[PDB]
Design a protein around this ligand. Sequence first.
Ligand code: PLM
Length: 132
Amino acid sequence: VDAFLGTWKLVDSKNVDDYMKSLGVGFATRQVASMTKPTTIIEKNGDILTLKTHSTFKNTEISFKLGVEFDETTADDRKVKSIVTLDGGKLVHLQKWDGQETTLVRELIDGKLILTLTHGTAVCTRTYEKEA
Ligand SMILES: CCCCCCCCCCCCCCCC(=O)O
């Protein structure tokens, strides 16, 4: 996981509105989200990973061990069962609730961190660049 660690800032986003609409996020929150550029911080302490997402709108923090299920409350206030794993070099975060699923897949391409979010038929891609 070591190549994922650090501070990353959003530089590009495609289809976030479609993804949020699929999740049932209301139009006013979608407005703010389409204009926010979060910072994501990924840190490790032994086998515990901490993932922070900071912005002017909402802040979230989760800590987890790879491969061990945990309870998570998401930024849009879903209560989900989550698991994060390493699969083919990608960090795969699966959230399950009410019989639904959404995946958040992070992969490193050319030194950038690409986050792909899928729910239903909606696919959003967000690109993050590393801050020194
Ligand atoms: C947490 C910053 C985004 C603000 C949007 C809050 C309501 C939508 C939340 C949808 C799930 C989280 C999306 C994560 C996107 C990312 O980390 O870039």
